[PDB]
Structures are given as structure tokens and as C-alpha cells.
Design an enzyme around this catalytic site. Structure first.
Site, PDB file in Angstrom:
ATOM      1  CG  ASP A   1      -4.433 -53.292 -32.464  1.00 50.42           C
ATOM      2  OD1 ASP A   1      -4.366 -52.543 -33.460  1.00 50.42           O
ATOM      3  OD2 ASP A   1      -4.450 -52.864 -31.290  1.00 50.42           O
ATOM      4  CB  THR A   2      -2.757 -53.358 -38.264  1.00 48.40           C
ATOM      5  OG1 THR A   2      -3.711 -52.288 -38.242  1.00 48.40           O
ATOM      6  CG2 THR A   2      -3.369 -54.562 -38.962  1.00 48.40           C
ATOM      7  N   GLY A   3      -2.346 -51.826 -35.274  1.00 43.43           N
ATOM      8  CA  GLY A   3      -1.769 -50.700 -34.576  1.00 43.43           C
ATOM      9  C   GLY A   3      -0.943 -51.045 -33.363  1.00 43.43           C
TER      10      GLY A   3
HETATM   11  C1  LIG Z   1      -6.000 -51.933 -27.722  1.00 41.86           C
HETATM   12  C2  LIG Z   1      -6.988 -51.716 -28.863  1.00 41.86           C
HETATM   13  C3  LIG Z   1      -8.204 -52.643 -28.721  1.00 41.86           C
HETATM   14  C4  LIG Z   1      -7.488 -50.262 -28.938  1.00 41.86           C
HETATM   15  N1  LIG Z   1      -6.421 -49.275 -29.216  1.00 41.86           N
HETATM   16  C5  LIG Z   1      -5.837 -49.300 -30.568  1.00 41.86           C
HETATM   17  C6  LIG Z   1      -4.424 -49.905 -30.594  1.00 41.86           C
HETATM   18  O1  LIG Z   1      -4.091 -50.278 -31.939  1.00 41.86           O
HETATM   19  C7  LIG Z   1      -3.280 -49.007 -30.096  1.00 41.86           C
HETATM   20  C8  LIG Z   1      -2.810 -47.948 -31.115  1.00 41.86           C
HETATM   21  C9  LIG Z   1      -1.722 -47.079 -30.532  1.00 41.86           C
HETATM   22  C10 LIG Z   1      -2.010 -46.284 -29.421  1.00 41.86           C
HETATM   23  C11 LIG Z   1      -1.009 -45.495 -28.893  1.00 41.86           C
HETATM   24  F1  LIG Z   1      -1.306 -44.731 -27.819  1.00 41.86           F
HETATM   25  C12 LIG Z   1       0.279 -45.448 -29.407  1.00 41.86           C
HETATM   26  C13 LIG Z   1       0.526 -46.252 -30.507  1.00 41.86           C
HETATM   27  F2  LIG Z   1       1.770 -46.245 -31.050  1.00 41.86           F
HETATM   28  C14 LIG Z   1      -0.438 -47.065 -31.080  1.00 41.86           C
HETATM   29  N2  LIG Z   1      -2.168 -49.869 -29.715  1.00 41.86           N
HETATM   30  C15 LIG Z   1      -1.977 -50.350 -28.463  1.00 41.86           C
HETATM   31  O2  LIG Z   1      -2.552 -49.995 -27.455  1.00 41.86           O
HETATM   32  O3  LIG Z   1      -1.015 -51.314 -28.528  1.00 41.86           O
HETATM   33  C16 LIG Z   1      -0.124 -51.475 -27.410  1.00 41.86           C
HETATM   34  C17 LIG Z   1       0.499 -52.867 -27.597  1.00 41.86           C
HETATM   35  O4  LIG Z   1       1.524 -52.669 -28.554  1.00 41.86           O
HETATM   36  C18 LIG Z   1       2.174 -51.426 -28.256  1.00 41.86           C
HETATM   37  O5  LIG Z   1       2.479 -50.726 -29.428  1.00 41.86           O
HETATM   38  C19 LIG Z   1       1.471 -49.707 -29.637  1.00 41.86           C
HETATM   39  C20 LIG Z   1       1.137 -49.253 -28.223  1.00 41.86           C
HETATM   40  C21 LIG Z   1       1.130 -50.580 -27.444  1.00 41.86           C
HETATM   41  S1  LIG Z   1      -6.521 -47.792 -28.415  1.00 41.86           S
HETATM   42  O6  LIG Z   1      -5.463 -46.931 -28.947  1.00 41.86           O
HETATM   43  O7  LIG Z   1      -6.606 -48.125 -27.000  1.00 41.86           O
HETATM   44  C22 LIG Z   1      -8.057 -46.989 -28.875  1.00 41.86           C
HETATM   45  C23 LIG Z   1      -9.185 -47.168 -28.077  1.00 41.86           C
HETATM   46  C24 LIG Z   1     -10.377 -46.539 -28.426  1.00 41.86           C
HETATM   47  C25 LIG Z   1     -10.408 -45.748 -29.563  1.00 41.86           C
HETATM   48  C26 LIG Z   1      -9.268 -45.581 -30.353  1.00 41.86           C
HETATM   49  C27 LIG Z   1      -8.071 -46.196 -30.020  1.00 41.86           C
HETATM   50  C28 LIG Z   1      -9.562 -44.660 -31.513  1.00 41.86           C
HETATM   51  C29 LIG Z   1     -10.839 -43.936 -31.047  1.00 41.86           C
HETATM   52  C30 LIG Z   1     -11.562 -44.961 -30.151  1.00 41.86           C
HETATM   53  O8  LIG Z   1     -12.454 -45.713 -30.973  1.00 41.86           O
END
Ligand SMILES: CC(C)CN(C[C@@H](O)[C@H](Cc1cc(F)cc(F)c1)NC(=O)O[C@H]1CO[C@H]2OCC[C@H]21)S(=O)(=O)c1ccc2c(c1)CC[C@H]2O
Lengths: 99, 99
Positions: free
Chosen positions: A25-27
Site C-alpha cells: 500500500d503506497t497510500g
Molecule cells: C487499507 C487499504 C487496504 C485501503 N485504504 C487505502 C489506504 O491506502 C489508505 C489511504 C489513506 C486514507 C486516509 F483516510 C488518509 C490517508 F492519508 C491515506 N491508508 C490507510 O488506511 O493507511 C493507514 C496506515 O497508514 C496511515 O497513513 C495513512 C492513513 C493510515 S482505504 O483508504 O481504507 C480505502 C478503502 C476502500 C476504497 C478506497 C480506499 C478508495 C475507494 C474504495 O475502493
């Protein structure tokens, strides 16, 4: 290995003697894993997401072998819907986005 | 362009004539954007993530130019903490993970 995004980027990881599947997960800034008994001392922390926040246990300097590449870094453990490897560990294995 | 992951992989997007910054997120199946005024008809939907679910508006066949690469696909709009480009659009611009 070059990974296309037509499917979820799931990889096999080895952590604490257990094999699991995690999402590259790059996000995600850090790594959070579903509930498990990771050895060592930890301090409570809170992480946020699209739906809100969850309570996690922060373990530091934890060894993880992601798809055969080893890395040591902070690993969070809590009620995450899926195991996600964040950028804190992706940088150690030399992961890059390419387009 | 090759992107290392030591910093958030943020890119500039153009959607609806509007300039914004979005996160290239391989862990997201689809695209969700912070509140914005997108033209067209939409359908209510629910997406889940870490912390729970949010209600978003589903816009289909939306043009987005990501770092100069054009794509058309479904774009969700709701109370997301950050703009996220999901795999639905990353695949159109030819994004691949490499380590
Ligand atoms: C967990 C994964 C499998 C799925 N996620 C993607 C994830 O990359 C997410 C991105 C994010 C979200 C955010 F609210 C703020 C941010 F700054 C960044 N990061 C995340 O939760 O990471 C965490 C740990 O690190 C910390 O830093 C970042 C936040 C903390 S999701 O967002 O739940 C999701 C689910 C279903 C759908 C989508 C998105 C798009 C439509 C539908 O398909």
C-alpha cells in the site's frame, strides 16, 4: 518483481514465525497488521483512515520478510480490515511506483 | 517517472477544470476525492476502510489528467481525509510497482 495493479498487490510476508498475506500500500505511511501476538514492548497509539480511527499497538524494530526481502521497522497491530505494508517498510525493500 | 516512497507519492491532477493534489494509492481499489463540485448525475454509495465507512457520491466516466496522463473512470466524492487515486485509474496510466 514488477507488479501490475489490475489486481490487489498482495504479497506473502513472514513475521514472528508466521506467514501472512499483506497488501503493498503506497497510500499508507506505516504498516498495520491484523491482530497477532508480536513479541516485545509496545506503547498504545491511534491511526486514522477513511472511516475514522482505530486503536493499535505500536511495536518498534520488528523484523518482517516481505516477498523474500527483509526489513525492520515499526509494525502496528490492531483491528485493521486487511494487512497493509506502508511506506515505512516499502522504502527498505526498494519499492517504487513506475508509469 | 519513477517515484520512490520515502515521501508521500503525491501528484497533481486536473479534474473538472480544477487543480488538486492526490495520493497515488496502490492499496485503493477505486478513486475517492475530497468534497468537490463535479458536474453530472451521481448515485449514492458506501465505501469502507480503516475506521469504518463513509457515504460518497459515485460519478462515472470522469476525466482526470494525472501528472499529464489522461484517464476516464469512476470517481467517488465524499468525506475522505485525502484525495486518493485508486487502481481503477492507476491501471489506465500504466502504473506498476517495482522492488
Ligand atoms: C487499507 C487499504 C487496504 C485501503 N485504504 C487505502 C489506504 O491506502 C489508505 C489511504 C489513506 C486514507 C486516509 F483516510 C488518509 C490517508 F492519508 C491515506 N491508508 C490507510 O488506511 O493507511 C493507514 C496506515 O497508514 C496511515 O497513513 C495513512 C492513513 C493510515 S482505504 O483508504 O481504507 C480505502 C478503502 C476502500 C476504497 C478506497 C480506499 C478508495 C475507494 C474504495 O475502493
Amino acid at each position: 518483481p514488477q507488479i501490475t495493479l489490475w489486481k490487489r498487490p498482495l504479497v506473502t510476508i513472514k513475521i514472528g514465525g508466521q506467514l501472512k498475506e499483506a497488501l503493498l500500500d503506497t497510500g499508507a505511511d506505516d504498516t498495520v497488521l491484523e491482530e497477532m501476538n508480536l513479541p516485545g514492548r509496545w506503547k498504545p497509539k491511534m491511526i486514522g483512515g477513511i472511516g475514522g480511527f482505530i486503536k493499535v499497538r505500536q511495536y518498534d524494530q520488528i523484523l518482517i520478510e516481505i516477498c523474500g526481502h527483509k526489513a525492520i521497522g515499526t509494525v502496528l497491530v490492531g483491528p485493521t480490515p486487511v494487512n497493509i505494508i506502508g511506506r515505512n517498510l516499502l522504502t527498505q525493500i526498494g519499492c517504487t511506483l513506475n508509469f
